[PDB]
Amino acid sequence: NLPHEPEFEQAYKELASTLENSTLFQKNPEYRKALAVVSVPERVIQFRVVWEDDAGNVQVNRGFRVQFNSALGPYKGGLRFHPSVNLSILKFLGFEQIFKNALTGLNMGGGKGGSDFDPKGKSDNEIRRFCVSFMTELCKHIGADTDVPAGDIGVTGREVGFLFGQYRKIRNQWEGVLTGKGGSWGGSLIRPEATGYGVVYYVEHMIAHATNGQESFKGKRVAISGSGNVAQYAALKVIELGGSVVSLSDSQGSLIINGEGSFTPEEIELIAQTKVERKQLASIVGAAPFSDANKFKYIAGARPWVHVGKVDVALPSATQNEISGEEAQVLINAGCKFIAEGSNMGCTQEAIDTFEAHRTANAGAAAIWYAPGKAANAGGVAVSGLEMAQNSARLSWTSEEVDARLKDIMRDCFKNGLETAQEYATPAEGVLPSLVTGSNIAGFTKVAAAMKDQGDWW
Amino acid sequence: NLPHEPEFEQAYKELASTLENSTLFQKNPEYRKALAVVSVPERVIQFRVVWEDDAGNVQVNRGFRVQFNSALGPYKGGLRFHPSVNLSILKFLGFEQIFKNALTGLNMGGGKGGSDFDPKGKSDNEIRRFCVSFMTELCKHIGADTDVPAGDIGVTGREVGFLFGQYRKIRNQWEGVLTGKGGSWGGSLIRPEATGYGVVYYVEHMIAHATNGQESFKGKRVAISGSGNVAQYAALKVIELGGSVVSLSDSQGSLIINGEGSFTPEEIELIAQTKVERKQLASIVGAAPFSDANKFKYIAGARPWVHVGKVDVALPSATQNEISGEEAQVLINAGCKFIAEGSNMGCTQEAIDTFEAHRTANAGAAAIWYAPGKAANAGGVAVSGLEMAQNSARLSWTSEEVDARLKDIMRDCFKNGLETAQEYATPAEGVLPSLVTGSNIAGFTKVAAAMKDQGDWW
Amino acid sequence: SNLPHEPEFEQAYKELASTLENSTLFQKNPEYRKALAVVSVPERVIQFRVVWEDDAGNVQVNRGFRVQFNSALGPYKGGLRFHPSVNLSILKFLGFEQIFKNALTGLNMGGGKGGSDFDPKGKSDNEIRRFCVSFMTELCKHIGADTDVPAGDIGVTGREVGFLFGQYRKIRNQWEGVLTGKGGSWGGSLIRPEATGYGVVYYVEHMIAHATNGQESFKGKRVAISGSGNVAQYAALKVIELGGSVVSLSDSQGSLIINGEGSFTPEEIELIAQTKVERKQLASIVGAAPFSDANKFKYIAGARPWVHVGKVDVALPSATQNEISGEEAQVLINAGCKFIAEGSNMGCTQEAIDTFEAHRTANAGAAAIWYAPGKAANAGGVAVSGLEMAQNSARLSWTSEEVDARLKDIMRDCFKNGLETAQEYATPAEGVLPSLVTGSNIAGFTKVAAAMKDQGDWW
Amino acid sequence: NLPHEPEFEQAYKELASTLENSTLFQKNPEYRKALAVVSVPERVIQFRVVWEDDAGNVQVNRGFRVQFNSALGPYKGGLRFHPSVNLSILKFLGFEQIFKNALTGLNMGGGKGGSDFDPKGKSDNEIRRFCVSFMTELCKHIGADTDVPAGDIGVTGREVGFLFGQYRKIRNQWEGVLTGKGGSWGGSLIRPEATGYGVVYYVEHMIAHATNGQESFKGKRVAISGSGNVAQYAALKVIELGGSVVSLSDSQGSLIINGEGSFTPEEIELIAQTKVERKQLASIVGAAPFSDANKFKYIAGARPWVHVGKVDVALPSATQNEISGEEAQVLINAGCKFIAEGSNMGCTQEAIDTFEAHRTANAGAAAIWYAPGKAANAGGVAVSGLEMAQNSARLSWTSEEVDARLKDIMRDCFKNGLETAQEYATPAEGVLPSLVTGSNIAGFTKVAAAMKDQGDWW
């Protein structure tokens, strides 16, 4: 009699459902056995973590590493320190990580870990001691050839460092055992740029396919929402490829271009400085360059979608549910043909459904083409693979090298979606395949066939 | 945020209760910290087990090893294969194992493991393939100085053989990694006898103490339940000591003696053979000697306790929760003055409360005296420690040497419980000390103190 | 080379070497001169940084050391010392001696010594825990039940051994005999507290028997002891149990003497033990019974007991190193003392040792004072550590009587080996007592050097 | 108390003094804690080395490995066999190695080891046996992910081969555990070239910065001293980049170009053959091509500095203390703007002082710019990292690939010095940053911040 694990059960049921609404099990019914094998994790470690607080008292938390699947590579996935953490949640997140990592084409398996340790209110001294204790036990079960964790909620650069330092001390090895490391001790260039550059490259690959290699970002008008790092670097990449960035935004309003034109790199760097100083877009229109009313128009309380006029590409990069069903319709009437999520779950289900029905109802490049976040914002995962690659040679690559490689990985990510959809949700003649359906299946099918090849099931 | 683990949480709450109801936390209030720490397992491993059935189909089950505590020694405790198995249950069994193992005097930590694999209806080949697969993963986490498992429900000598065989092949070490091994490949004499002998030995000390050296098993009437190896060898040792054995039973009914007789060794040998053949007591009453209705009465559907009439000692040795509140009172009315669990968790908390209430109410030899399983049925795990001792010595001791050490262990276990109750749960004059409270405190403090010494808490 | 100056170690090497030269050993086996040169260089030395957090939350740095000197006879064995004086030279000195002390027990134990310059003085239990955790995080790599088995020494008692054991078992994930001096319920040995003290006395029993042709024992002898910790206590109680009289104890502040005939009783030693548990002085118990009975007890502040004991038959220095000067050696000689053995490690100064030895070689029969070296006479401690390792591998706890029995046999064999080896290689003049110093040094060295040769460490 | 370690204490004091004469401890006083922690080695192994001489006699020597710091990478640094070897000396060298290695921007820590073994007058056989015995112990402590030694005085190709053979045998792994290996068994192309080429690339980066990327080696006149591997390859690189090499020299004299012109690659090759035959430059001037007195002038007993006329770059690449105070002033007067040490400690302190005062007194490209050897001759170390990178993939890069990558590493070495001087020894407006000060501080700052991130100090 199995324990109640609602978050994991939900995630399994969603996969099994998306697999069922496809021809996968008509063509390959034996993959139902794969579904059953894959959803029992290969290994789970749980361990007590004892650590000393600043008053000198004994404290107790619970440590976790779910090593869910390793058919395609060593276990890969983040560590989460948050009071809500438990096996059920970490299984949900680790299970999903299998298939998102699989989607990229990198040799990365699937895992998730962490603790119910709550870093809110903790001194750095406390976080250090917790991390030291935590890694003392975890060290046994991980390694560059076995399991390579990373950060998540509660585990950023600071914690990764403390974790790395203690691993090194116990194991007496310097290796790529974590990703998200500092620039001087095995971190990668292009790490801040990864997500934003990643979305723009994915969309480039979409355009290329949709137009049979005749169009790129060159000459295209691109609406971006957000003004954090993802939006800034997506904007910079667009510009670098010859596109026009016509909008940026924050939670209070949108800053948009009047008529023809684009934001410039300099302007983007000014918006970055204002973002570092916690200031809102509303406050920078007072001075130049943004006080020029012939180039720039600030719109209070608005998202950009209905205000940019005619537009070719939309790149939501702010927050979740920032494209309504209604806004999807306007982008469609604005002639938008490509949309990809920079923000996690940026499109509402109504918007996704809209873009998909439009796709189904319109042959070729007359359709709007939506890419889901698990595919289009896999840049951060992509650069993690490159950080590992780089670590194996104790050698850093140039910005240009990491960038070029990030581009190729997003192509693999794209193609896995495209081809899976073509095979298992085959569209009508001249209709673009669904990247949402393709991306939801493709991880499972790559992992399942790998598992079969390796005798994990038969 | 934690998962609901009721079997485990109840055992914890109940131990905490017996510790509160004593002077232990008055004289050492710090030990409450130890309680919070010890209750979180050092390490838990869970893992997928894929195995092939006789049709050649893939089958999936879940593997577990709870390494609960190692302050006194390497993790020690059985493997259970039963479809009820899960983490909560093994946490429950593993927690109890800590304190049982502690009480043997031997350097043995507490652990428990197994699988939801059901051996019912499986071929021997299927069981072999399952054990090969199970041990392939488990081998990484165990070892002669790390974790030493053994049998339990679903895991007999047969399974231990398959498990050992696989370990030796992958680890390339021949060592005391398991106990309950076969005689020619590192098994110990007296291991089959140990639990049953051990409870009888323990109870002999109870009789001695409660009667001020007046009495022994000589002339006592002893009601036993069950008919597996515990009940058998308990029966045989009672007979050796001059007691009468007046009942045995299985899951279908009770075989009782009429009048003032007793089972014989020869009759016990016959019941043992009927049990190897997985037959029932109801199948053997229709032929001699058990068809003799002057001596024997078979009672279908019944536990033996009402049907034995007046008895002096009760040795439940069948199954968990086989003595209820009602039956505790039946045994009190029968003139029963000693009860000790041969089986794991034989008495309900209601029966325990009933017995303890009776002890408190009735000074001296009038009291029914109850010994907890962690003390009284420690004989088995004790002889496992001796199997480990023998493997490390690279010798096989005679039956007489193993048996001698088992007697010293059960003696010291009784003395410790008795003296610890005298110190921290001091009874009124003439009142028997609580073996429940004394055994719990003794076991707990030995672990907690060792944990403090080793810096696990402070 | 330009080797670093390591005076403590270099001095011990030369003294050892000299005692070997004053024998037939290198005449009979000149090739052992190469053995000696090879044995003098440690097999392995590990040094390491130990970073640890104080109670104020500040980072602190100390240096950690393990000298794995020799392993021909067994895994490296020897204690850990936390004391501000600790460095490589000092640990090499103590590790070198440990080789030969361990060899004389007859058990399979090699020779090692380690520790840190961490100063436990003034540190909280918590600080001590944090230091041990961090220290063992690095040391774990280099030690093990079949590799190197440390123990306590100055600055490392049961408390530290516990924190050190706990951290090892956590990182290594093996429960094993990696340390000795462990606690009773987690693989310690009975008799370990008594070992060193009982051991000296057992050894001296054989000295007395040999010197007097079995005509005397401890019965009726007056015994002066210095110190008031475990060694002094259990030595005293064993002497009392053998029918001798203990006429002094002492601590770093003064000595507490018996006046006239008479002895400390076990009850008095028990009280003294309780006060030394409380970290009090012998000073601050004299004004309270029974130690205020100024007919039986005299206290002298600032003094060692040797000049105040009157006539004495046996002396058992059991406080600290270098606690019998050459002058005090003469005082004991003139007091009529005939038997001396060290309860404290390096109790006698070299000057005292040269005096006892001069006096032995100048006097026939039992008119001579007989000095036993520490490597023979206080091996009781490390012997029972060896027994602890044996118990751990047996996965059993022996009884008091069994550990004690074996301790007795070990000390007896150790005495015999020193005696007979001196008779063979450093034969005394007719009627002179065999030198247990030369005897023990030769016996220890040759056991190691011959085993090294069998194992191809030299040829 | 502590042992007397004079060479190490000196090296420690010089670092502490450099760090005090900067703004580092004003801006970041907590880095004093870093200095105290970093100056205690992480680990030191000493060991007895017993080996057999050619007469069959036992010999005894002392082996050492100082594993000083691993924050930025596995321990890296050479092995020295010389009768002066001891812990103090090896700590001195390993301490310096941390910060030099750090300076390259490669993921390499800092270490040094060796023995007091004297190879003077030993047979190849004796050297083989010593190495076998030495590596038998050392193997335990090192490894491709832990510690990667190399050569030094007493340890060249021959010894590296013997050491690697024995490691392979015992460890049964083929990996990059040593650098300086033979071409066919893991050595890198560009290895003989590395130091010489490395010096020239470093100067290229200096030229680019000083001139706004307006100038290069193209059209420059370059005075080089020495005529061994470093001068030869430095020369060849200069010629490849369009520069003129106007001198070379040996201990007895200088061979310089008469008027404008340059040595050619064919001429460099001739000088290389003569140097292999162990002939001095004085004796190659009696034949063609060097007898042509219109092109070549031999100056007996002179260094080249005062005899080359106007020159843009100076590359002392012969020995130590080969540019006097006077010669530094002559070079300044000859229009020399770039000076960098091919040879270890080639510039006297008077010369370094003179170049630094000139820099201070002369805004921008008017200055002569001195690069210290720890930065400019770090190419040997750079190619070591590339050898490690190539060993990971069991794959040799092309000469062009190794060479291009060496150039980049020398840019990182440059940037680390430049930027560090900018921050902590900030020059007046328009004045070049001190590469000597920058290079002496930059390694420490990189290591200290990585140490802090990793919880080594806090």
Ligand SMILES: O=C(O)CCC(=O)C(=O)O
């Ligand atoms: O011998 C063993 O280790 C298994 C015994 C056990 O699990 C028990 O005491 O219930």
Ligand SMILES: O=C(O)CCC(=O)C(=O)O
């Ligand atoms: O118990 C041990 O291992 C030896 C302690 C020690 O170093 C000694 O004999 O002084």
